[PDB]
Write a protein that holds these residues in place. Structure first.
Motif, PDB file in Angstrom:
ATOM      1  N   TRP A 236       0.808  -1.216   0.000  1.00 47.75           N
ATOM      2  CA  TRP A 236       0.000   0.000   0.000  1.00 47.75           C
ATOM      3  C   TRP A 236       0.842   1.267   0.000  1.00 47.75           C
ATOM      4  CZ3 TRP A 236      -4.375  -0.274  -2.082  1.00 47.75           C
ATOM      5  CH2 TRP A 236      -5.129  -1.448  -1.985  1.00 47.75           C
ATOM      6  N   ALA A 237       2.097   1.179   0.427  1.00 52.12           N
ATOM      7  CA  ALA A 237       2.994   2.323   0.349  1.00 52.12           C
ATOM      8  C   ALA A 237       3.204   2.788  -1.083  1.00 52.12           C
ATOM      9  CB  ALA A 237       4.334   1.959   0.982  1.00 52.12           C
ATOM     10  N   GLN A 238       2.924   1.942  -2.067  1.00 52.82           N
ATOM     11  CA  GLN A 238       3.084   2.313  -3.461  1.00 52.82           C
ATOM     12  C   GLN A 238       1.861   3.014  -4.029  1.00 52.82           C
ATOM     13  OE1 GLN A 238       6.072   2.129  -4.993  1.00 52.82           O
ATOM     14  NE2 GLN A 238       6.631   1.636  -2.872  1.00 52.82           N
ATOM     15  N   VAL A 239       0.807   3.193  -3.236  1.00 51.79           N
ATOM     16  CA  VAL A 239      -0.443   3.788  -3.697  1.00 51.79           C
ATOM     17  C   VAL A 239      -0.622   5.111  -2.961  1.00 51.79           C
ATOM     18  CG1 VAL A 239      -2.921   3.490  -3.954  1.00 51.79           C
ATOM     19  CG2 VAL A 239      -1.381   1.498  -4.137  1.00 51.79           C
ATOM     20  N   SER A 240      -0.561   6.218  -3.702  1.00 51.54           N
ATOM     21  CA  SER A 240      -0.691   7.535  -3.088  1.00 51.54           C
ATOM     22  C   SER A 240      -2.008   7.640  -2.331  1.00 51.54           C
ATOM     23  CB  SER A 240      -0.628   8.624  -4.162  1.00 51.54           C
ATOM     24  OG  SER A 240       0.655   8.695  -4.758  1.00 51.54           O
ATOM     25  N   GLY A 241      -1.929   8.062  -1.071  1.00 51.95           N
ATOM     26  CA  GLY A 241      -3.114   8.267  -0.273  1.00 51.95           C
ATOM     27  C   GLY A 241      -3.687   7.023   0.367  1.00 51.95           C
ATOM     28  N   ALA A 242      -3.098   5.853   0.136  1.00 49.44           N
ATOM     29  CA  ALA A 242      -3.601   4.649   0.776  1.00 49.44           C
ATOM     30  C   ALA A 242      -3.223   4.656   2.248  1.00 49.44           C
ATOM     31  CB  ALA A 242      -3.031   3.416   0.083  1.00 49.44           C
ATOM     32  N   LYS A 243      -4.112   4.126   3.082  1.00 48.49           N
ATOM     33  CA  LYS A 243      -3.883   4.127   4.516  1.00 48.49           C
ATOM     34  C   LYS A 243      -4.747   3.050   5.144  1.00 48.49           C
ATOM     35  N   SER A 244      -4.318   2.587   6.312  1.00 44.30           N
ATOM     36  CA  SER A 244      -5.122   1.678   7.110  1.00 44.30           C
ATOM     37  C   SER A 244      -6.084   2.496   7.963  1.00 44.30           C
ATOM     38  CB  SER A 244      -4.230   0.816   8.001  1.00 44.30           C
ATOM     39  OG  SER A 244      -5.013  -0.109   8.731  1.00 44.30           O
ATOM     40  N   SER A 245      -7.366   2.158   7.884  1.00 49.19           N
ATOM     41  CA  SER A 245      -8.424   2.854   8.603  1.00 49.19           C
ATOM     42  C   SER A 245      -9.020   1.914   9.640  1.00 49.19           C
ATOM     43  CB  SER A 245      -9.509   3.311   7.629  1.00 49.19           C
ATOM     44  OG  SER A 245     -10.659   3.752   8.330  1.00 49.19           O
ATOM     45  N   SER A 246      -8.881   2.265  10.917  1.00 49.99           N
ATOM     46  CA  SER A 246      -9.506   1.446  11.949  1.00 49.99           C
ATOM     47  C   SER A 246     -11.028   1.531  11.890  1.00 49.99           C
ATOM     48  CB  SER A 246      -8.977   1.832  13.331  1.00 49.99           C
ATOM     49  OG  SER A 246      -9.113   3.222  13.556  1.00 49.99           O
ATOM     50  N   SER A 247     -11.576   2.671  11.464  1.00 51.74           N
ATOM     51  CA  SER A 247     -13.029   2.793  11.372  1.00 51.74           C
ATOM     52  C   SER A 247     -13.591   1.930  10.248  1.00 51.74           C
ATOM     53  CB  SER A 247     -13.436   4.258  11.209  1.00 51.74           C
ATOM     54  OG  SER A 247     -12.802   4.852  10.092  1.00 51.74           O
ATOM     55  N   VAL A 248     -12.868   1.819   9.135  1.00 49.92           N
ATOM     56  CA  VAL A 248     -13.342   0.971   8.050  1.00 49.92           C
ATOM     57  C   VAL A 248     -12.986  -0.489   8.304  1.00 49.92           C
ATOM     58  CG1 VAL A 248     -13.173   0.535   5.575  1.00 49.92           C
ATOM     59  CG2 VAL A 248     -13.306   2.892   6.425  1.00 49.92           C
ATOM     60  N   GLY A 249     -11.864  -0.747   8.960  1.00 48.05           N
ATOM     61  CA  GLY A 249     -11.423  -2.094   9.220  1.00 48.05           C
ATOM     62  C   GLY A 249     -10.364  -2.616   8.281  1.00 48.05           C
ATOM     63  N   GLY A 250      -9.577  -1.746   7.669  1.00 47.87           N
ATOM     64  CA  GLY A 250      -8.492  -2.197   6.827  1.00 47.87           C
ATOM     65  C   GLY A 250      -7.987  -1.073   5.944  1.00 47.87           C
ATOM     66  N   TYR A 251      -7.130  -1.463   5.008  1.00 47.23           N
ATOM     67  CA  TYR A 251      -6.554  -0.515   4.069  1.00 47.23           C
ATOM     68  C   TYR A 251      -7.599  -0.033   3.076  1.00 47.23           C
ATOM     69  CZ  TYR A 251      -1.765  -1.052   5.631  1.00 47.23           C
ATOM     70  OH  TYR A 251      -0.600  -1.022   6.363  1.00 47.23           O
ATOM     71  N   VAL A 252      -7.630   1.283   2.890  1.00 49.54           N
ATOM     72  CA  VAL A 252      -8.449   1.948   1.895  1.00 49.54           C
ATOM     73  C   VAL A 252      -7.514   2.780   1.035  1.00 49.54           C
ATOM     74  CG1 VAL A 252     -10.562   1.955   3.258  1.00 49.54           C
ATOM     75  CG2 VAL A 252      -8.922   3.852   3.470  1.00 49.54           C
ATOM     76  N   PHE A 253      -7.990   3.127  -0.148  1.00 55.41           N
ATOM     77  CA  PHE A 253      -7.165   3.883  -1.076  1.00 55.41           C
ATOM     78  C   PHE A 253      -8.073   4.780  -1.893  1.00 55.41           C
ATOM     79  CE2 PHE A 253      -8.166   1.846  -5.097  1.00 55.41           C
ATOM     80  CZ  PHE A 253      -8.723   0.653  -4.690  1.00 55.41           C
ATOM     81  N   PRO A 254      -7.538   5.855  -2.466  1.00 54.03           N
ATOM     82  CA  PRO A 254      -8.386   6.749  -3.260  1.00 54.03           C
ATOM     83  C   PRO A 254      -8.917   6.023  -4.483  1.00 54.03           C
ATOM     84  CG  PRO A 254      -6.296   7.795  -2.674  1.00 54.03           C
ATOM     85  CD  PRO A 254      -6.155   6.346  -2.357  1.00 54.03           C
ATOM     86  N   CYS A 255     -10.221   6.164  -4.732  1.00 57.42           N
ATOM     87  CA  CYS A 255     -10.783   5.489  -5.892  1.00 57.42           C
ATOM     88  C   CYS A 255     -10.206   6.009  -7.200  1.00 57.42           C
ATOM     89  CB  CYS A 255     -12.314   5.575  -5.880  1.00 57.42           C
ATOM     90  SG  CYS A 255     -13.124   4.681  -4.518  1.00 57.42           S
ATOM     91  N   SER A 256      -9.525   7.156  -7.175  1.00 53.89           N
ATOM     92  CA  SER A 256      -8.863   7.693  -8.354  1.00 53.89           C
ATOM     93  C   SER A 256      -7.566   6.970  -8.699  1.00 53.89           C
ATOM     94  CB  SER A 256      -8.582   9.186  -8.155  1.00 53.89           C
ATOM     95  OG  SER A 256      -7.822   9.411  -6.979  1.00 53.89           O
ATOM     96  N   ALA A 257      -7.097   6.056  -7.854  1.00 60.56           N
ATOM     97  CA  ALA A 257      -5.809   5.407  -8.054  1.00 60.56           C
ATOM     98  C   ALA A 257      -5.907   4.249  -9.038  1.00 60.56           C
ATOM     99  CB  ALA A 257      -5.291   4.865  -6.723  1.00 60.56           C
TER     100      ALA A 257
END
Ligand SMILES: OCc1nc([C@]2(O)CN[C@@H](c3nc(-c4ccc(C(F)(F)F)cc4)no3)C2)cs1
Length: 330
Positions: A236-257
């Protein structure tokens, strides 16, 4: 003997795949989730608590001339997402894609948890892990594959899952037209009852391959690819803006990626998961945050090569005396 059945995604995300299964006489066709990570064949039934049935097709053993109560047998199972089901047991004739087992344990649900009720497309599960995980008590029961194995031309089944498209489960033979190149076989440990194997490493996108042993299970019943936090962070470090979200329950990323591919090692061979396979779409309708298909296994206790990984390959589940797994590109 052999069997061959088409498996179809339940929705536009490939959240799960359903395969038609004939149960009883006359046949009652239910769409089951074939799950190489568990070992119970259970169905929504005429016994399932009415308030917990919402659109599923039910098995009615009283309408099957070949059904017999397995007297005194009960079952109760929980899954890795926290879902669960339980009930009693019939034996009946079960056919998958032309392959018939008589006397198969068909576990009839009396109770199912909310996630099962809410999925109107899944009429039950058909477990394909090792029979040592089967939950029937007091007499543990064999899986459909275990029961069929001695009759099959070869003691194998294969999973050829599609990306946003149907695929195929074959029993008893390897379709040499279904894959490219060779199938690389790798050793299986049955010590935990799973199709457990060791991947030889990974690569992210066009990056170099990292040789590292990754124990995990081949699990057609798990949607995503769950790997160690180190590996998942490197992806996920290779995807701009990707991050682990505790509220969502995992890694999320910008849908523009546009996502990079992910490669995993099978012995000296490599399976490449295209970036698009890792996109599970908006976290909620209209959101611009998208859910990642590669997630951390931390706190699961086991790495899981679920559908995200398996659908990039033609996968052989070899149930010979020494079991092995085979992976080919396709
Ligand atoms: O502890 C980590 C581990 N987990 C496992 C599994 O439990 C066995 N394979 C997977 C599997 N999940 C499902 C499934 C769960 C819920 C639903 C629902 F949403 F419809 F309810 C549908 C299918 N089927 O198979 C996970 C093995 S190791």
């Amino acid at each position: 003997s052999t069997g061959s059945a088409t498996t179809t995604p339940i929705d536009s995300l490939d959240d799960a795949y359903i395969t038609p299964v004939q149960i009883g006489t006359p046949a009652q066709t239910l769409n089951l989730d074939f799950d190489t990570g568990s070992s119970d064949l259970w169905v929504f039934s005429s016994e399932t608590t009415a308030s917990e049935v919402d659109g599923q097709t039910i098995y009615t053993p009283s309408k099957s001339t070949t059904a017999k109560l397995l007297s005194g047998a009960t079952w109760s199972i929980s899954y890795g997402d926290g879902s669960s089901s339980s009930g009693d047991v019939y034996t009946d004739t079960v056919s998958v894609g032309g392959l018939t087992v008589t006397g198969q344990a068909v576990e009839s649900a009396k109770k199912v948890s909310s996630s099962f009720t809410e999925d109107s497309t899944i009429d039950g599960l058909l477990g394909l892990a090792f029979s040592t995980l089967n939950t029937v008590s007091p007499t543990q029961q064999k899986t459909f594959f275990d029961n069929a194995k001695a009759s099959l031309d070869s003691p194998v089944f294969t999973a050829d899952l599609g990306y946003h498209a149907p695929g195929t489960y074959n029993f008893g033979f390897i379709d040499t037209t279904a894959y490219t190149g060779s199938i690389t076989y790798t050793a299986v440990s049955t010590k935990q009852g799973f199709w457990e194997w060791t991947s030889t490493g990974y690569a992210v996108g066009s990056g170099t391959f990292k040789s590292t042993s990754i124990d995990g299970i081949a699990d057609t019943g798990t949607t995503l690819l769950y790997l160690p936090a180190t590996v998942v962070s490197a992806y996920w470090a290779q995807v701009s803006g990707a991050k682990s979200s505790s509220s969502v329950g995992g890694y999320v990323f910008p849908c523009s990626a546009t996502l990079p591919s992910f490669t995993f090692g099978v012995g000296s061979a490599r399976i490449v998961i295209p970036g698009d396979y890792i996109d599970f779409g908006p976290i909620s309708t209209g959101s611009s945050s998208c859910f990642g298909g590669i997630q951390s296994s931390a706190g699961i206790g086991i790495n899981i090569f679920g559908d995200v990984a398996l659908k990039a390959a033609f996968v052989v589940f070899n149930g010979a005396t020494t079991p092995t797994l085979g992976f080919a590109s396709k």
